[PDB]
């Protein structure tokens, strides 16, 4: 199971939310694997849809 | 005449019903006078009889006398001004046709608003008429006249929120 | 004598016509209001129609329509006698007071004209029905239909109604050819001065509503003024600014700092050396050579006033190239002060209508809600335009300004701002990075590495 | 939360015996039309002829 | 009329009496009379009653001779109202058998048309004299509508109440008309999509159609695709009202859609030879057809829309489809104080226009923000807040939903759902389509169907 | 019928129905839009004058009617419409059945069966109407309803009689209501 | 033009023509005219356009005589809108050189001030007739603000867009 | 004596206690002023099915020119469309 921890996942989400504005689509982002793609995208959508705070994000 | 509404817009804004309601409420209730006094002035009334009635009622209130229909009619009769107002018949019509159980504050505000709008329109007309006919006045004189005429509208308050006071008066009070 | 039994032709009012004509003579700025409510054919007497036609022609030529000018124009064409003469013109000038409710008189004239024409058409149709004179039923029906349809005539110029596909196709081909004639390097509208923004937006398109939104201190005014400066330098049409936030002097000081690339604090405090003075002199010389920037710093403006002033500027100087409003949270709609959502919807609708009418890009600045500062990611989204759903619905382009160093003192992106395209109606969306020089109150092209 | 409440209610009903009803359905749809264009046009013409005042063209 | 106007209302008693007598004497000519005159074309009540009774007897399978007609009238107690057996015998006797009843029927037909035109003129004059709170726009709209109903259709009467015979004839005519042209399950305007045609049977005339979606869902794109398909698959003109975009951008989108050329290239002009050839072919087809009209005016009112639609229908003898985008930008100046009344008036006027011109009217609309806060964001009727009258008055309601707009992870990329929220005369459900935003196009869904 | 895909038995049924209707000839239809109460009264009077009286008047629906002089206030317009309809009904001595619509807030209540207060903006309708009936179909709101095909007519106000619920069978296939043959309580 | 009760906006075409002709003939007095009158003070579009072009030429370091002014206008395509070389020559010729342009510039002055005052009065009356949801207090505040702004330094009209020249002078 | 029947607006039903008062004659101020006697009719069984006052109606005198005010209870036989004297306890 090559899955990141909570802190690594949150850091990846923050980096994605910083950098994804410079790419044509979410699939153009340099993903490490499919699990990272799904986790980061789902967290990003949930955060931007429900106005999650930092603790709620974690 | 021959005017449905073509000549009906030369008439300055006003409301006879609000004036009659206020006068009737004052006649049939002397406890609300101050509430009327803080919202309307004798110059806010469009017709001369209403201004005269309000002035006489204010005088009677300041003299401590009741301002009921009988006392007001007697006071007008003694001064000989009852005929000019419209008569005891008109006074009784105002007293009766206008209910006592009413909210006179709304009618007072209505009377206040129409007077402001009408005076503003009249001042604008005077300013434009003076502009078209200088009669030797310079531009500075016309501008000063316009400014004085415009700011004289919001002025003319008897005694309500005297406003800013010079440091001399406040220092004397202290 | 004519008693109350005179009921043949009631619907007319000579007094209303005289009031309208006199008011137009005394006040020429009301013409538009009269023009939208009455036409030359709504007047019952021939002299009044002739007067209105001559006044319309003079207004179209740009000349004033006062008494002396109108009389002089009529005398040149020899038509002064037909009106009634300078005597009648002077009578109209003298009798009409300045206490004129010209709109009400125009509406009264309009209603009477419509009623009278409808009655006359009904009489014609009935009399034709009673006297066929050899016409068939289809001929009578066609005559009646034509007569009834001909009544509705409005002063609106060409392109008022529907347009055949041939004309629109000709216009599209002409637009493509015009875009191909002058190489603007991928820019079809007003140039923004920034390469990446030009690539993503193809300039500021005419007839589009553009919204710029950000939290306070992000740089909405700075970015808007930079766009105005770039549009003024890279065009020939006037550029109009509605600054309800700042006086014109501070705006000009920021503009001088931006254009001359002199430190803003030095200009504000007056501590300038010789090179700075030379730069400022050159900038002022260029600006006074161009002369295409207009600033209006009035506060509490309604959409009607904005439309009127924009129309007046376009009429005086033959067109506009860009309109800028800063910001729409200070505009007022008194009839809807009770409900904020309806007021914002009305403002957005009027701005879109004005942009479409004048064929100019209109940029309007806006503010965001405080709740954005509580989310984990503070970059703006569309839903952060709370109370302004109509803004999201009506805007053709929506850009958000974001600076990370505002929220994070230890940010790694200091001096870098993001323009986030939250909605583009005719293009893609994404993030454009720019450099923020707050010293000169300027945004510049991002020279850093691009991913 | 609603799903949890519904699960609790359904489990309580099941543990108390009871029988889960088998929907209700709503009617068949029928069909079976061996009629083509020409025959239906003939039927329309027959109706027109019988009723006469159709005036349809 | 003799001297000046004496027989002022156009009528001829002699022709009516001759027609009735000939019908009594020769029952075989009834059909020739039945296709040239109606009961309502007669001026007197007795003649209308006699003609109605004769029609009833003839369509019940019975002779319409004098004795049978009198017997039928007597049983219903209406013989005295007509004038009696004496008047029936007078009609039978006075009119000679050897008559050319076709000319008399045609004469009766024409006088009725002229008299009804005079009647509508009188109604227009009466409405003009007593406005009863109507503005000038309302009076002009009323007059234009009445005269258009007089002229455009068959030269028949005003709106009025109609007997069940005329409505039955109209229904039979509608069935025959739908049968004569095999459209393979399409009775209205062909939408161009197979599944939408199956669910809706095309866009039905005299129906109000609402297309609703959140911003950037493809509402304008879908409406323009419907307009293009209606123009290509029909001969009647198609009218567009656009308060949102200039006509030039509309034409660029239409070129991208029809020629299947990327819209960015067309907008920036960076095309190649094959794209230029496709655009040339599309322009040739469009200029050969010439049945699309575009109005990009701003601040439209319902009166302006109705007037311009009537003018177009007068110019080209009918309309095929009307499209409005969108109704949140329309204005009713007399009701600017309350927005809800303004929206209700707009919806009612659109429904009235659709009914009057017998054309489908498709109006675009927006939804509320709270929809984005639900667990499932697919629209429902209640998401039309501020527009309850829109839900109440609309004949068809379609919501556009793209899942990729909300979720980047969506497996339904390029797939859009048309959700029928209210279908008054059919089923409701979801239709899947393919969304090609590159060409600004919707296409039939080629994937598997559950 | 709408698509024209009928067979011989359906055509025979339609022919019989058309024959019966053409033998009766007592149904008149006016499909005008935006009618004022004055026009409705005038047309009803004309029909009654020509054909010796009326048996029933039906309007669908009153929200589409117009009173130009009172377009500013909806409540006054509805009150005037209801008063004019009542006056017409009393004048012609005929029953007048007018269809109406209900507010959206009804859909937010726990029970969605209509009540009088659901006639919001139309209090004068409740005041003036002699009979008020609400149509309720449970299957419209609930897909898993046990009352599919069953509709309820709820008498919200009867001036000269009782009130309650009447159950009918709804055949939307034929666009018809029929007597309920199920068990009655 | 008896002027025995006539209501005409205050203006004088003769003064404008004299000022323009004098500036054409003698470019040195331009400053003496630039301190007394602005472009907006002119009543006609051609005169405003001519004055603006002359100001632009003078502040760009160029003579503003007839030939140079006509050539500069022609290059921008605005010569036809002004009235043409014929009208420019008429302005140059009809107005005598021996004139006092100071008095005429002071005439193209305050007449515009009176016109602005009349415009402000008309705006106040129009706002009073159609409140559009405004209360009486709001109308009074608007009138007071307008009449207060107009009577302070009289730089230009009550309020509106201003050319960048005036804003640059203020800065 | 002239007895004119009137009706009340729905706003009265927005209160917890729905018994009418004089101020409930809104939009009819002239009626309230000119009236010499004002009587309101109330029935508790209309609003509450489980009410204990079934068949009992209240006549409430909201304004009397020449007398007192109060509530009078009566029996309501809607079967015969009649009002009768109340035989129960009076308060
Ligand atoms: N002299 C200066 N040097 C550097 N930055 C400045 C200077 N003056 C203003 N700024 C920056 O400008 C920002 C606000 O500019 P402005 O566009 O007026 O804000 P708003 O977003 O309210 O329009 C502030 O965050 C401030 O950091
Ligand atoms: N040049 C383009 N390339 C690709 N997609 C585009 C382009 N322009 C617009 N779109 C798409 O069109 C959609 C919105 O279309 P439209 O229906 O006109 O807007 P609305 O739905 O607000 O009416 C957006 O979601 C966008 O993705
Ligand atoms: Mg700012
Ligand atoms: Mg759109």
- E185 shares a domain with E90: no
DSSP assignments along C310-370, one per residue: HHHHHHHHT--SEEEEE-TTS---GGGSS-HHHHHHHHHHHHHHHHHHHTS-EEEEEE--G
C179 and C65, same domain (yes or no): no
- CA C220 to ligand 3 centroid distance, Å: 5
The domain in which residue F173 lies consists of: 1-185
Tell me if E424 is assigned to a ligand binding site.
yes
Q: Are residues C325 and C431 in the same domain?
A: yes
Inside any domain, residue C153:
no
Burial class (CB within 10 angstroms; exposed 0-12, middle 13-18, buried 19+) of C239: buried
Angle between helices B48-63 and B16-28 in degrees, nearest 10: 20
Write out residues 289-348 of C within 8 Å (CB-CB) of G: 289, 291-296, 298, 309, 312-313, 316, 333-337
Instruction: Look at residue E76 and give its three-state secondary structure.
Output: coil
Residues C317 and C304: their CA atoms lie apart, in Å, by 20
Q: Is the Cβ atom of C438 under 6 angstroms away from ligand 1?
A: yes
- The residue contributing the CA closest to ligand 1 atom 10 is C438
E183 in the same domain as E58: no
Neighbours of chain E (3+ CB pairs under 8 A): A, C, D, F
Q: Do residue E176 and residue D55 have CB atoms under 8 angstroms apart?
A: no
Q: Quick check: F88 and F41 in contact, CB under 8 A?
A: yes
Bridge partners for G162 per DSSP: C295
Rounded to 5 degrees, φ, ψ at D55 are 60, 25
User: Per CB distance under 8 Å, which residues of F are interface residues toward D?
Assistant: 4-8, 11, 14-15, 18-19, 22, 139, 144-146, 148-149, 173
Residues E120 and E17 in one domain: yes
Q: How far is the CA of C226 from the centre of ligand 3 (A)?
A: 13
Find out whether E215 and C381 touch, Cβ atoms under 8 Å.
Answer: no
Residue E204, number of CB atoms within 10 A of its CB: 19
Considering only CB atoms, which chain H residues are within 8 Å of F123? Answer: 9-10
Closest ligand to residue E324's CA? 4
| Closest among B110, E131, B100 to H32, alpha carbons compared | B100
CA H53 to chain centre: 15
Q: Return d(Cα G56, Cα E425) in angstroms, integer.
A: 72
The answer to whether position G165 is within a domain reads no
Is the shortest distance between the CB of C264 and ligand 1 below 6 Å? Answer: yes
Q: Is residue E71 domain-shared with residue E212, that is, in the same domain?
A: no
SS3 B174: coil
Tokens in use for C371? 């709740």
The sign one gets for the Cα dihedral C18, C23, C28, C33 is: negative
Q: Kindly report the number of other CB atoms within 10 A of residue G95's CB atom.
A: 21
Other beta carbons within 10 angstroms of residue E108's beta carbon come to: 23
Whole-number Å distance between alpha carbons of C107 and C38: 7
Q: How many C-beta atoms surround the C-beta of residue B11 within 10 A?
A: 9
Query: Last residue of some domain: C76, C103, C130?
Result: C130
Quote the CA–CA distance of H19 and H40 in Å, as a whole number.
Answer: 8
Is C136 within a domain?
Answer: no
CB E20 within 8 A of CB E51: yes
First CA to last CA distance, chain C: 93
| Contact between residue C451 and residue A22 where contact means Cβ atoms under 8 Å apart | yes
Q: Residue E328 has what DSSP assignment?
A: T
**CA distance between the termini of chain F:** 38
C198 in the same domain as C119: no
Q: What residues of B are in contact with residue G113 (Cβ under 8 Å)?
A: 139, 143
Q: Give me the phi and psi of G109, to 5 degrees please.
A: -75, -145
Contact between C260 and C221 under an 8 Å Cβ cutoff? The reply is no
Cα G118 from chain centroid (whole Å): 16
Q: CB of C287 within 8 A of CB of G168?
A: yes
Q: Whose alpha carbon is nearest atom 25 of ligand 1?
A: C217
Distance CA E240, CA E363 (A): 10
B81-to-B30, B69, B88 alpha-carbon distances in Å: 22, 15, 11
CA gyration radius for chain G?
19
E143 belongs to a structural domain = no
Indicate whether C45 belongs to any domain.
Answer: yes
How wide is the angle at C-alpha E301 spanned by C-alphas C120 and E203, nearest 5°? 110
Q: How far are the Cα atoms of C197, C324, C412 from residue C434, in angstroms, in the given order?
A: 9, 21, 15
Distance of CA E32 to the CA centre of its chain: 31
Query: CB neighbours of C369 closer than 8 A, spacing ≥ 6?
Result: C384, C385, C386, C387
User: Who contacts H32 (Cβ-Cβ below 8 Å, separation ≥6)?
Assistant: B101, H22, H25, H38, H63
> Measuring from atom 6 of ligand 1, which residue has the nearest CA?
C438
Q: Assess contact for C66 and C25: CB atoms under 8 A.
A: yes
For residue G102, tell me if it sits in a domain. yes
Picking from F170, F99, F113, the residue whose alpha carbon sits closest to that of residue F141 is F113
Contacts of H29 in chain B (CB under 8 A): 99, 102
Resolution of the experimental structure, in angstroms? 2.7
- Distances from the Cα of F114 to the Cαs of C120, F101, F157, G11, in angstroms? 52, 11, 12, 73
- Please give the torsion angle defined by the CA atoms of residues H25, H28, H34 and H36, in that order, rounded to the nearest 10 degrees: -30
Q: H57-75 in b/e burial notation, b at 16+ Cβ within 10 A?
A: bbebebeeeeeeeeeebbe
Q: Is B129 on the interface with C (CB under 8 A)?
A: yes
Q: In this structure, what token pair is assigned to residue E414?
A: 């390029």
Closest CA to C376 of A44, F107, G43: A44
Q: What backbone phi and psi angles, to 5 degrees, belong to F28? A: -125, 140
E222 in the same domain as E78 = no
Q: Which residues, at least 6 apart from C347, have a Cβ–Cβ distance to it below 8 Å?
A: C303, C328, C331, C333
Chain B residues within 8 A of G36 when measuring between CB atoms = none
Residues with C-beta less than 6 Å from any ligand 2 atom: C 425-427; E 213, 215-221, 263-264, 437-438
Cβ pair H13:F117 closer than 8 A: yes
Say whether both C243 and C107 belong to one domain: no
Shared domain for C296 and C204, answered yes or no, is yes
Q: Residues of B with CB below 8 A from C98's CB?
A: 124-125, 128-129, 132
- Total Cβ atoms within 10 A of residue E383: 21
Asked if residue C220 has its Cβ within 6 Å of ligand 1, the reply is yes
- The count of other CB atoms within 10 Å of the CB of residue C379 is 18
Q: Does residue C219 line the site of ligand 1, with CB under 6 A? A: yes
Alpha carbon distance C92, C51 (integer Å): 11
Kindly state whether residue G15 falls inside one of the protein's structural domains.
Answer: yes
Q: What are phi and psi of C307, to 5 degrees?
A: -65, -45
Alpha carbon distance C6, C9 (integer Å) = 8
Handedness of CA G78, G82, G87, G90 (dihedral sign): negative
Cβ neighbours, 10 Å, residue E194:
14
| Interface check D14 vs E, CB under 8 A | no
* DSSP assigned state of C400: E
Answer whether C26's CB lies under 8 Å from G7's CB: yes
C36 to each of C53, C103, C107, F67, G52, how far by Cα in Å? Answer: 14, 10, 10, 27, 32
Q: Which is it for the CA torsion C251, C252, C257, C259, positive or negative?
A: positive
Residue having the nearest C-alpha atom to atom 5 of ligand 1: C438
Q: Report yes or no: G121 and B146 within 8 Å, Cβ to Cβ.
A: yes
How far, in Å, CA of C429 to CA of C423, rounded? 6
Spatial separation of the C-alpha atoms in residues C57 and B100, rounded to whole Å: 61
Task: For chain C, say whether E143 makes contact (Cβ under 8 Å).
Answer: yes
Q: How far apart are CA E109 and CA E106, in angstroms?
A: 5
- Residue H42: which of H56, H32, H26 has the closest Cα? H56
- In chain D, residues with a C-beta closer than 8 Å to the C-beta of E175 are 44
- Rounded distance between C-alpha atoms, residue E398 and residue E429, angstroms: 10
Any binding-site annotation on E422?
Answer: no
Judge whether A26 is closer than 8 Å to chain E, CB to CB. yes
Residue F175 to residues C156, C356, F118, G87, Cα–Cα distance (Å):
50, 48, 26, 82
> Residue E48 has which token pair?
């209308």
Cα→Cα distances D48→E63, E68, F16, F18, H83, Å: 18, 24, 13, 11, 64
Domain harbouring G107, CATH code: 1.10.860.10
C165 neighbors E292 (Cβ within 8 angstroms): yes
Q: Which two tokens stand for residue E99?
A: 């008559």
Asked whether the beta carbons of H85 and H61 are under 8 A apart, the reply is no
d(CA E215, CA E220): 10
Determine contact: H13 vs chain F, CB below 8 A.
yes
Phi, psi of H35 (to 5 degrees): -70, 135
SS3 C421: strand
- Is residue C162 lining ligand 1, measured as CB closer than 6 Å? no
Is the omega angle on the peptide bond into residue H48 within 30 degrees of 0, that is, cis?
A: no
**How many C-beta neighbours within 10 Å does residue B51 have?**
17
Contact partners, residue B143, CB within 8 Å, separation at least 6: G113, G117, G150, G151, G154
Q: How far is CA G116 from CA C99, C310, G41, G111, in A?
A: 17, 19, 10, 9
CA distance H42 to E288: 76
Instruction: Show the DSSP H helices in chain D as ranges.
Output: 2-15, 37-51
* Structural domain count of chain C: 2
Task: Check CB contact of G34 with chain C, cutoff 8 Å.
Answer: no
Domains and CATH numbers, chain B: 9-132 (1.10.860.10)
Chain breaks of chain H after residues with C–N above 2.5 Å? none
Interface D-E: count of C-beta contacts within 8 A: 39
E374–A contact, CB cutoff 8 A: no
DSSP state at residue E235: S
The CA angle E430-E433-E434, to the nearest 5 degrees, is: 150
β F96-98/F57-59 pair status = parallel
CB contact under 8 A, C376 and A47: yes
Nearest by CB to residue F107, choosing from E164, E351, E382, is E382
Which mutation among E254, E440, E441 tests ligand 2's pocket best, with the greatest number of atoms within 8 A of CB? E440
E162 lies within 8 A of chain F by CB: yes
Q: Regarding beta strands C362-367 and C209-214, do their DSSP bridges make them parallel or antiparallel, or are they unpaired?
A: parallel
C417-to-C259, C398, C403, F8 alpha-carbon distances in Å: 20, 16, 5, 76
Residue E363: half-sphere exposure toward Cβ, Cα within 13 Å: 25
How open is the CA angle G20-G21-G25, to the nearest 5 degrees?
A: 120
Distance CA C349, CA C354 (A): 9
Question: Order of strands across the sheet with E396-402?
Answer: C163-164, E292-295, E238-242, E321-325, E361-366, E208-213, E396-402, E415-423, E430-436, E441-444
Q: State yes or no: chains E and B have 3 or more CB pairs below 8 A.
A: no
Can you spell out the DSSP letters for B77-141?
HHHT-HHHHTHHHHHHHHHHHS-SSS-HHHHHHHHHHHHHHHHHHHHHHHHHHHHH--TT--HHH
Q: What is the DSSP letter of C48?
A: H
**D11 vs D2, D18, E30, E65, E67, CA distance in Å?**
14, 11, 77, 81, 82
Strands C209-214 and H82-85: unpaired
CA distances from E131 to C148, E166, F67 (A): 17, 33, 12
Residue C88 tokens read as 């009648």
Residues C240 and C375 in one domain: yes
Tell me which residue of C341, C325, C321 sits closest to C333, measured CA to CA.
C341
| C271 shares its domain with C326 | yes
Counting CB pairs under 8 A, whether chains G and F reach 3 or more, is: no
Residues whose beta carbons lie less than 5 angstroms from ion ligand 3: C 220-221
C-alpha–C-alpha distance, residues E383 and E375, integer Å: 14
Chain centre to alpha carbon of residue H59: 4
Q: Quick one: CA dihedral C445, C446, C447, C451, positive or negative?
A: negative
Cα distance between residue E85 and residue E70, in whole Å? 7
Q: Could you tell me the distance, in angstroms and rounded to a whole number, from the CA of residue E216 to the centre of ligand 2?
A: 6
Beta strands in H1-91 (DSSP E): 37-43, 56-64, 71-77, 82-85
Alpha helices by DSSP H, listed for chain F, are: 8-24, 37-51, 74-92, 123-128, 138-141
Q: B101: closest CA among H22, D23, H79, C393? A: H22
Tell whether ligand 1 has an atom less than 6 A from the beta carbon of residue C439.
yes
Question: CA C260 to CA C283: how far, in whole Å?
Answer: 6
CA distance F6 to E179: 12
Put simply, the answer to whether F117 touches H7 (Cβ < 8 Å) is: no
Residue position matching structure tokens 């030939």: G67
Q: Which of E268, D30, E391 is nearest to C186 (CA)?
A: E268
- Give the span between the Cα atoms of C19 and F74, in whole angstroms: 36
Interface test with G, best of C237, C297, C308 (most G CBs within 10 A): C297
Q: Residue C55: name the closest of C17, C12, C95, C91 by CA.
A: C17
- Does the residue G71 lie in any domain? yes
**Which of these, C375, D3, E408, E215, lies nearest to A50 by C-alpha position?**
C375
Task: Give the contacts of B124 (CB within 8 A, at least 6 positions apart).
Answer: C98, C99, G121, G122, G124, G125, G128, G143
- Supply E436's token pair: 């090609």
Q: Strand order of the sheet with strand H82-85? A: H37-43, H56-64, H71-77, H82-85
Side-chain half-sphere exposure of E104, counting CA atoms within 13 A? 20
Report the alpha-carbon distance of residue B170 to residue C417 in Å, rounded: 54
Report chain D residues whose CB lies below 8 A from the CB of E29: none
* DSSP three-state, residue C435: strand
CATH number at residue F57: 3.40.50.300
Q: Which residues of C207-237 are buried (b: 16+ CB within 10 A; e: fewer)?
A: bbbbbbbbbeebbbbbbbbbbbbbbbbeeeb
Structure tokens at C32: 């538009």
- Nearest CA-CA distance, residue F75 and chain D, Å: 40
User: How buried is residue B103: exposed, middle or buried, by Cβ count under 10 Å (0-12/13-18/19+)?
Assistant: exposed
E242: β partners:
E325
């Amino acid at each position: 199971a090559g899955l990141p921890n909570v802190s690594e996942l949150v850091d990846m989400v923050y980096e994605y939310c910083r950098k994804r504005g410079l790419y044509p689509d979410a699939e153009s982002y340099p993903w490490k694997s499919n699990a990272h793609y799904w986790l980061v995208t789902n967290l990003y959508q949930n955060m931007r849809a429900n106005a999650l705070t930092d603790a709620e994000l974690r | 005449e021959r005017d449905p509404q073509v000549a009906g817009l030369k008439v300055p804004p006003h409301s006879i019903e609000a004036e009659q309601s206020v006068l009737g409420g004052l006649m049939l209730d002397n406890e609300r006078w101050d509430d009327v006094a803080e919202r309307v002035v004798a110059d806010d009334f469009y017709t001369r009889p209403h201004r005269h009635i309000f002035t006489e009622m204010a005088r009677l209130q300041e003299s401590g006398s009741p301002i009921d229909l009988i006392t007001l009619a007697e006071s007008l009769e003694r001064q000989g001004q009852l005929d000019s107002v419209g008569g005891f018949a008109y006074l009784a019509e105002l007293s009766k046709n206008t209910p006592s159980a009413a909210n006179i504050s709304a009618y007072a505000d209505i009377v206040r608003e129409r007077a402001v709008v009408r005076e503003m329109i009249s001042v604008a007309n005077e300013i434009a008429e003076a502009g078209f006919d200088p009669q030797g006045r310079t531009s500075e004189d016309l501008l000063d006249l316009a400014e004085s005429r415009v700011f004289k509208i919001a002025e003319s308050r008897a005694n309500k929120d005297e406003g800013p006071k010079n440091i001399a008066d406040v220092l004397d009070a202290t | 004598d004519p008693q109350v039994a005179g009921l043949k032709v009631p619907p007319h009012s000579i007094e209303a016509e005289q009031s309208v004509l006199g008011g137009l003579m005394l006040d020429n700025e009301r013409w538009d209001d009269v023009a939208e409510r009455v036409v030359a054919d709504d007047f019952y007497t021939r002299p009044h129609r002739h007067i209105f036609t001559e006044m319309a022609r003079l207004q179209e030529s740009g000349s004033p329509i006062d008494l002396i000018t109108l009389a002089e124009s009529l005398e040149r064409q020899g038509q002064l006698d037909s009106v009634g003469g300078f005597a009648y013109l002077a009578e109209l000038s003298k009798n009409t007071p300045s206490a004129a409710n010209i709109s009400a008189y125009a509406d009264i004239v309009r209603e009477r004209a419509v009623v009278r024409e409808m009655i006359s058409v009904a009489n014609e149709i009935a009399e034709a029905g009673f006297d066929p004179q050899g016409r068939t039923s289809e001929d009578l029906l066609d005559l009646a239909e034509s007569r009834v349809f001909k009544i509705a005539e409005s002063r609106a110029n060409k392109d008022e109604g529907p347009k055949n596909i041939a004309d629109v196709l000709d216009a599209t081909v002409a637009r493509i050819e015009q875009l191909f004639q002058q190489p603007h390097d991928g820019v079809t509208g007003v140039n923004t001065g920034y390469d990446d923004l030009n690539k993503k937006t193809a300039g500021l398109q005419p007839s589009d509503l553009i919204i710029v939104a950000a939290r306070p201190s992000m740089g909405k005014t700075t970015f808007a003024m930079n766009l105005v400066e770039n549009a003024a330098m890279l065009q020939d049409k006037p550029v109009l600014i509605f600054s309800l936030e700042m006086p014109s002097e501070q705006i000009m000081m920021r503009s001088l700092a931006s254009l001359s690339r002199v430190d803003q604090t030095k200009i504000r405090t007056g501590q300038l050396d010789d090179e700075d003075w030379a730069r400022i002199s050159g900038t002022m010389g260029i600006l006074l050579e161009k002369r295409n920037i207009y600033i209006d710093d009035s506060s509490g403006l309604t959409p009607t006033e904005v439309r009127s002033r924009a129309r007046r500027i376009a009429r005086e100087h033959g067109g506009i190239g860009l309109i800028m409003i800063d910001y729409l949270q200070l505009m007022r709609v008194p009839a809807l002060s009770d409900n904020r959502t309806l007021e914002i919807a009305e403002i957005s609708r009027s701005l879109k209508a004005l942009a479409k009418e004048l064929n100019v890009p209109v940029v309007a600045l806006s503010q965001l809600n405080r709740s954005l500062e509580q989310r984990a990611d503070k970059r703006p989204v569309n839903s952060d335009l709370r109370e302004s759903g109509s803004i999201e619905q009506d805007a053709d382009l929506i850009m958000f300004i974001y600076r990370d160093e505002v929220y994070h003192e230890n940010s790694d992106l200091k001096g870098i701002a993001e323009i986030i395209i939250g909605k583009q109606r005719n293009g893609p969306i994404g993030t454009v990075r720019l450099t923020f020089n707050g010293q000169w109150s300027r945004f510049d092209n991002y020279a850093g590495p691009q991913y | 939360r609603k799903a949890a409440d519904e699960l609790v209610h359904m489990t309580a009903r099941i543990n108390r015996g009871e029988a889960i009803p088998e929907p209700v359905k709503q009617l068949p749809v029928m069909g079976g039309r061996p009629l083509n264009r020409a025959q239906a046009l003939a039927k329309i013409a027959e109706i027109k002829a019988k009723f006469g005042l159709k005036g349809a063209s």
